[PDB]
Design a protein around this ligand. Structure first.
Ligand SMILES: *[C@@H]1O[C@H](CO)[C@@H](O[C@@H]2O[C@H](CO)[C@@H](O)[C@H](O)[C@H]2NC(C)=O)[C@H](O)[C@H]1NC(C)=O
Ligand SMILES: CC(=O)N[C@@H]1[C@@H](O)[C@H](O)[C@@H](CO)O[C@H]1O
Ligand SMILES: *[C@@H]1O[C@H](CO)[C@@H](O)[C@H](O)[C@H]1NC(C)=O
Ligand SMILES: *[C@@H]1O[C@H](CO)[C@@H](O)[C@H](O)[C@H]1NC(C)=O
Ligand SMILES: *[C@@H]1O[C@H](CO)[C@@H](O)[C@H](O)[C@H]1NC(C)=O
Ligand SMILES: *[C@@H]1O[C@H](CO)[C@@H](O)[C@H](O)[C@H]1NC(C)=O
Ligand SMILES: *[C@@H]1O[C@H](CO)[C@@H](O)[C@H](O)[C@H]1NC(C)=O
Ligand SMILES: *[C@@H]1O[C@H](CO)[C@@H](O)[C@H](O)[C@H]1NC(C)=O
Length: 1276
């Protein structure tokens, strides 16, 4: 017996099991079949038991109809033999839930921080068409901590394809991410992608023979190449050591390498023993200024002959008895075919001997004929010049050595006859055939040849075979089963997509014509990967879709299982990038030719492309189109990130020439907008050109000596060209020109609100500096035109990093409230809200809470804030992990005391908020505030709230601190408490009033916050008019961006301001602003209250008084922004900072010892979350981990190396009197002369006034110590 059926079952699938009786002992065979099944629960699902007789020399096809109600578990078919026949074999069956399978394509395997992950999702049914059932999917992407960063709740498919993207933020969560698609609630497919940060001063060296060495050369030529992980070439010295005879030193050369270098190593006498001898070469690369060394060793092979030979076998093994063709490929050492090598090829095992010469294509073709008994084939080649080559060819792993071959003798048209040619070793009594389509046996048959070896098998192509089917033939020779498969693909009914390149060569930077043809109106999905990108990461989506295009067990591959008798056996006969993420339609007729620009870069490409027609299904190209591009010539910069005014700077560059010859290069550094003064040249010079000879495959330096003129951003503009201008390259890089001192701009603000036509005159005493006047028709115009960066301070902590999140909610809040017709803004804010969400997930802890730090530092304050913060944002973005919020609110709820009180579990970094020294009134009121602002949260946690509101009620007459009370009041105001009015009046009673200014604030330490909470409660209690003097103060405390100086104040402040201005600003703006100063009078007009992005500058020169006349109806802010360039000088206020530059014994290394401690006062003996910034003198750069000597009194909770290693930021928890110290290690990596001094700063985060700055000087170098001979002044 031969029992064969599918190995898979489906809900409503037929199961046709085909039994063949060739056993001739009996005249019939009686069989019992049981197909049992059991769910994962343990419930019995299947007990379909059938009995049948299979007569001699025929087939019986059995159908098992499957119950619609199948669920995954444990299934198997059992063919046990009844009556007089001893037979019992069984085979386990798998459940396939879906009639569809899916594919996730991603443009890269790994991503650098600021990248955009691109993905396609492809759904295909069992016919390789787009599923007519499924219209959309459910795609979510999770970060390395499983957080739901994005989500497509209803991702509509087009031609079974969903295309989308995801931006990885500036400072993201590193590791493995997880795209996962879901259909009808069941996960269909899942792909991972990685995110790694490629920083550090770590570099790689490679050594290779520039030309494959011959014995005849008596010399080794080398290419030495050292690049940083960044992609930039390394400058340094290469120490070369060559070893000809074992570990005995033969030679030592040294060369300065600028990324790429050539070295020649000559020998005295080198006679080899064989025709190939290895040579060990050690290279030691010493990084230019640090002296950091990387050693690379390699075995460089030397050869006797100028050619090598390989054997091009038609197949890896020969079938004994059948002609085995092959050839010898003669390859020149690196390159051509060896056209004309004479020799004799000898295969003794067939008795074949030929003396010939390699042809034009460099080949000698062997068409051997091994007989029935041939073990190995000894292909031996001996040449007239003595060259020797022998490689053995072995026979196919003969499980039988008696085969059956099936050959489809004509094209497979639908309905038309299918003709096949069966060839078999034995004279056949019988053969079986089976036909699979859509995972089940469609047709079978017991064919009986008349003791023949050949049979012309003729079958009708039925409709159940459309469009992809597969036929399988089997028979018995001896007591072993032999078989063969054949593909039955109706080409006339399938997607015949093809993609091609032009008949021209591919030049990097130039454009190429892509010619593709296929089904009209079909979807096409192009992608091009860097072949080097498919390195350690893929070694790849293409194989999966290649595998999905069609279909060593040739049954389990055909989707079947096979059983036979106990004595019968089975046979077995066997810089970088990402570009061209396009998707096009075949359209018009039968081909669409898209035209594209090849990236200007030295890289090996890999170009794929699939196609999906709604009718015709999937199409694919065979091998991905593959080429490489070598950019002829390019320049590479090596520039400091920041320089100061009046320092002399060497801008280094490196030219690479990849052309055949050595050509002179011109490099021209341009003076863009008076930015750049070339040292020793007339100031009116617009450019400066130098010219250098550049050898092939060698890096050559070229530098310019400059000093910066204007502050801000210096554009470093360079054009280059070799070979008379035939090959050009240019770069547009930027060095940032910093002031000498830590500059901080002040901004005085006035606001007007006129409902009825009103004239008024606002004076502005301006009392070195530069001034700018701004009129802004909305609180948020300055804010939104700054969103992505609102604060002058770093924000690398859980609380601070919310500036990327919260301000966006509030800007979205307002725009929807007022019903803004400026969708243009809403878009920016909504986009930034999402990226803000992702950024913040980095501060999620394991227990569901949020912490001040990435790894540690869990916090109650923060958890309340972040949790409820997100709950609000939910109405503006789909992507929020709804349960993740709930689980964060639940962590919070449990942390409450029995009184209803909340304490901060973990260190104190925001004192007024996290201080328990005042009944924890602050934190309690805050947490209650957070819960109350969300309708879901208010109901779900109502019991926790009720306990808190009572704790406040019992505390109300006891609260005597303005901060605490302001929130307690806000809580009650939101709550709708009975004692709300009381609370607010007790707050009002604490207010500082200045009637000679129309200002009202709430005092001591955290004024901006307290006052904001206060105003919120006002607007709540409809005290709008009384809120106007409150606002007047707040608006005047704003930072230049439109926000407030710090994090929290911004958050509560902007909230307060928008809230009042919602209820006080007139429905229509129609007014004129007259600006009188010095001599001039400027005029501004506002007539559309609508528009937000609406800028009104004017730069007053250093004048005296300033007089503004507002006339009409509307809202407005009159801002006057003083910006300061001051002298850099030491200052201390309630912090004591000290600097000491320890000795290193190297000019090219700075180590600075820094010491900072808080100066206490009265009850205040400890600071808030304190940061230290370290600025380096121009040219210096900090390494990977530049900090050492760290004190354990107060430990650095977080480090931030920003600004291309110019600045190190150091987050502490707090500072006491106990000295907190460390030591920075920087390296002078750029030539900068006349260096102006740097500084270190310590500050309290949430208290502006408490800070300390200390200046320090490094050896300020001179112009002569730095200039190249051409640019040098006479004094050298
Ligand atoms: C290429 O794929 C994109 C999906 O990114 C398809 O663009 C969508 O087209 C439909 C109409 O067919 C629109 O309703 C969507 O708004 C489009 N989405 C986007 C993001 O623009 C497009 O169908 C595909 N094919 C071609 C030829 O452009
Ligand atoms: C040009 C220059 O400054 N060269 C110095 C050299 O004088 C000094 O002896 C050495 C360290 O010992 O470092 C280098
Ligand atoms: C299944 O049903 C058949 C016939 O109805 C019976 O003979 C057999 O015992 C049953 N098997 C199981 C495992 O329940
Ligand atoms: C190796 O390079 C050196 C220097 O460029 C040259 O003298 C020699 O001809 C080269 N050898 C070969 C085999 O190209
Ligand atoms: C298949 O083709 C036609 C269907 O109309 C039929 O007449 C013929 O008998 C069939 N059989 C074979 C063996 O081709
Ligand atoms: C170039 O820069 C400075 C800007 O402070 C200015 O004083 C100087 O006159 C400028 N020169 C020209 C030609 O604009
Ligand atoms: C406002 O000022 C203008 C011009 O100075 C003056 O004519 C007028 O009295 C004022 N107008 C109103 C409507 O108050
Ligand atoms: C590196 O070696 C050079 C050799 O001149 C020396 O000047 C310098 O002091 C060394 N730097 C360090 C960091 O050891």
């Amino acid at each position: 017996l031969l029992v064969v059926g599918p190995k898979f079952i489906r809900a409503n699938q037929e199961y046709t099991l085909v039994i063949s009786n060739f056993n001739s002992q009996l005249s019939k065979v009686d069989l019992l079949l049981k197909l049992e099944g059991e769910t994962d629960n343990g419930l019995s699902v299947l007990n379909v038991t059938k009995m049948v007789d299979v007569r001699r020399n025929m087939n019986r096809m059995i159908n098992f109809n499957m119950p619609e109600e199948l669920t995954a578990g444990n299934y198997k078919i059992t063919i046990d033999g009844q009556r007089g026949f001893s037979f019992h074999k069984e085979a386990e069956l798998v459940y396939l839930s879906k009639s569809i399978s899916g594919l996730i394509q991603v443009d890269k395997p790994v991503f650098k921080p600021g990248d955009t992950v691109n993905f396609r999702v492809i759904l295909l049914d069992t016919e390789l068409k787009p599923p007519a059932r499924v219209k959309s999917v459910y795609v979510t992407i999770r970060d390395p901590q499983r957080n739901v960063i994005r989500k497509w709740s209803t991702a509509k498919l087009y031609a079974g394809v969903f295309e989308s993207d995801l931006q990885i933020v500036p400072t993201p969560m590193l590791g493995v991410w997880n795209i996962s698609v879901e259909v009808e609630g069941e996960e269909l497919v899942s792909k991972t992608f990685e995110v790694k940060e490629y920083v550090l001063s770590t570099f790689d060296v490679q050594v290779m023979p520039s030309v494959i060495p011959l014995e005849e050369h008596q010399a080794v030529n080398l290419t030495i190449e050292a690049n940083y992980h960044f992609g930039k070439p390394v400058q340094g010295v290469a120490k070369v050591e060559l070893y000809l005879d074992d570990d005995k030193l033969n030679q030592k050369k040294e060369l300065t390498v600028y990324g790429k270098g050539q070295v020649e190593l000559r020998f005295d006498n080198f006679a080899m023993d064989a025709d190939q001898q290895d040579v060990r070469v050690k290279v030691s690369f010493i990084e230019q200024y640090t002296n950091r060394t990387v050693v690379k060793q390699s075995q460089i092979t030397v050869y006797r002959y100028a050619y090598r030979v390989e054997l091009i076998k038609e197949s890896p093994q020969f079938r004994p008895g059948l002609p085995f063709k092959c050839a010898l490929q003669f390859t020149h050492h690196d390159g051509t075919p060896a056209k004309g090598i004479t020799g004799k090829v000898e295969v003794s095992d067939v008795g074949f001997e030929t003396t010939t010469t390699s042809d034009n294509d460099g080949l000698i073709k062997l068409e051997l004929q091994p007989s029935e008994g041939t073990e190995q084939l000894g292909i031996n080649f001996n040449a007239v010049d003595g060259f020797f080559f022998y490689e053995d060819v072995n026979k196919v792993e003969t499980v039988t050595d008696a085969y059956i071959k099936l050959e489809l003798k004509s094209p497979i048209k639908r309905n038309k006859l299918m003709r096949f040619m069966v060839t078999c070793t034995e004279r056949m009594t019988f053969f079986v055939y089976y036909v699979m389509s859509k995972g089940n046996i469609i047709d079978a048959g017991f064919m009986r040849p008349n003791k023949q070896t050949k049979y012309l098998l003729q079958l009708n192509a039925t409709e159940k075979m459309i469009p992809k089917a597969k036929i399988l033939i089997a028979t018995v020779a001896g007591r072993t089963v032999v078989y063969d498969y054949a593909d039955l693909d109706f080409q006339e009914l399938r997607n015949n997509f093809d993609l091609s390149i032009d008949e021209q060569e591919i030049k990097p930077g130039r454009q190429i014509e892509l010619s593709m043809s296929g089904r009209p109106g079909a979807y096409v999905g192009l992608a091009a990967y860097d072949k080097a990108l498919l390195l350690f990461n893929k070694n790849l989506f293409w194989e999966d879709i290649g595998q999905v295009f069609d279909g060593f067990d040739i049954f389990h591959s055909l989707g079947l299982f096979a059983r036979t008798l106990d004595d019968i056996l089975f046979d077995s006969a066997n810089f970088q990038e990402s570009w061209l993420w396009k998707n096009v339609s075949i359209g018009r007729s039968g081909s669409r030719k898209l035209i594209e620009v090849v990236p200007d870069t030295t890289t090996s490409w890999y170009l794929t492309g699939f196609s999906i027609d709604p009718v015709y299904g999937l199409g694919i190209i065979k091998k991905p189109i593959q080429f490489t591009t070598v950019q002829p010539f390019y320049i590479v910069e090596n520039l400091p990130y920041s320089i100061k005014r009046g320092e002399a700077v060497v801008l280094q560059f490196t030219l690479f020439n990849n052309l055949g010859a050595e050509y002179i290069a011109d490099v021209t550094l341009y003076n863009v907008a008076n930015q750049t003064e070339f040292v020793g040249r007339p100031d009116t010079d617009l450019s400066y050109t130098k010219s250098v000879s550049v050898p092939p495959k060698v890096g050559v330096p070229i530098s310019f000596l400059i000093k910066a003129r204007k502050l801000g951003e210096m554009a470093v503009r360079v054009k280059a060209s070799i070979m008379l201008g035939h090959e050009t390259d240019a770069l547009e890089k930027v060095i940032r020109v910093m002031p000498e001192s830590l500059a901080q701009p002040k901004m005085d603000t006035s606001f007007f609100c006129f409902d009825d036509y009103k004239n008024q005159t606002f004076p502005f005493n301006l009392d070195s500096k530069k001034i700018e006047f701004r009129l802004n028709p909305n609180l948020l115009t300055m804010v939104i035109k700054n969103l992505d960066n609102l604060l002058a301070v770093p924000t690398g902590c859980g609380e601070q990093n919310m500036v990327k999140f919260v301000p966006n909610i509030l800007v979205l809040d307002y725009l929807y409230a007022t019903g803004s017709k400026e969708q243009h803004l809403i878009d920016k804010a909504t986009n930034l809200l999402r990226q803000g969400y992702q950024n913040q997930m980095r501060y999620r802890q394991t227990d569901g809470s949020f912490g001040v730090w990435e790894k540690s530092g869990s916090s109650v304050f923060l958890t309340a804030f972040v949790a409820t913060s997100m709950q609000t944002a939910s109405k503006y973005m789909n992507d929020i992990d709804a349960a993740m919020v709930e689980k964060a609110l639940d962590w919070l709820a449990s942390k409450q005391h029995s009184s209803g009180r909340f304490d901060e579990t973990g260190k104190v970094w925001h004192k007024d908020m996290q201080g328990g020294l005042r009944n924890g009134v602050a934190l309690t009121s805050y947490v209650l505030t957070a819960l109350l602002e969300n309708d879901i949260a208010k109901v779900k946690h109502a019991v926790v709230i009720q306990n808190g509101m009572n704790y406040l009620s019992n505390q109300l007459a006891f609260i005597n601190n303005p901060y605490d009370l302001s929130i307690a009041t806000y809580a009650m105001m939101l709550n709708g408490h009975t004692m709300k009015k009381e609370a607010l009046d007790k707050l009002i009673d604490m207010s500082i009033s200045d009637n000679n200014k129309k200002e009202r604030y709430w005092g001591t330490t955290n004024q901006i916050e307290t006052t904001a909470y206060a105003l919120l409660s006002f607007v709540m209690a409809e005290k709008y008019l009384d809120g106007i003097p409150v606002m007047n103060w707040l608006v005047n405390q704003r930072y230049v961006t439109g926000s407030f100086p710090r994090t929290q104040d911004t958050f509560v402040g902007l909230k307060a301001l928008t809230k009042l201005a919602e209820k006080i600003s007139p429905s229509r703006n129609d007014y004129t602003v007259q600006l009188k100063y010095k001599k001039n009078t400027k005029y501004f007009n506002i007539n559309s209250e609508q528009i937000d992005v609406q800028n009104f500058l004017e730069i007053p020169e250093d004048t005296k008084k300033l007089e503004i006349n507002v006339g009409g109806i509307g809202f407005g802010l009159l801002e006057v922004i003083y910006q300061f360039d001051l002298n850099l000088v030491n200052f201390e206020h309630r912090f004591k900072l000290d600097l000491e530059k320890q000795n290193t014994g190297s000019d090219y290394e700075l180590r600075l010892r820094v010491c900072a401690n808080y100066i206490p006062e009265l009850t205040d003996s400890q600071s808030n979350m304190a940061l230290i910034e370290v600025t380096l003198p121009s040219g210096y750069v900090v390494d990977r981990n530049p900090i050492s000597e760290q004190t354990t009194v107060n430990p650095i909770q977080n480090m931030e190396i920003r600004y291309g290693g110019t600045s190190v930021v150091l987050y502490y928890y707090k500072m006491g009197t106990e000295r907190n110290c460390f030591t920075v290690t920087a390296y002078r990596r750029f030539k900068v002369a006349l260096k102006r001094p740097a500084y270190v700063v310590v500050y309290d985060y949430y208290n502006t006034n408490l800070n300390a700055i200390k200046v320090y000087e490094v050896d300020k170098q001179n112009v002569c110590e730095i200039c190249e001979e051409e640019d040098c002044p006479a004094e050298c």
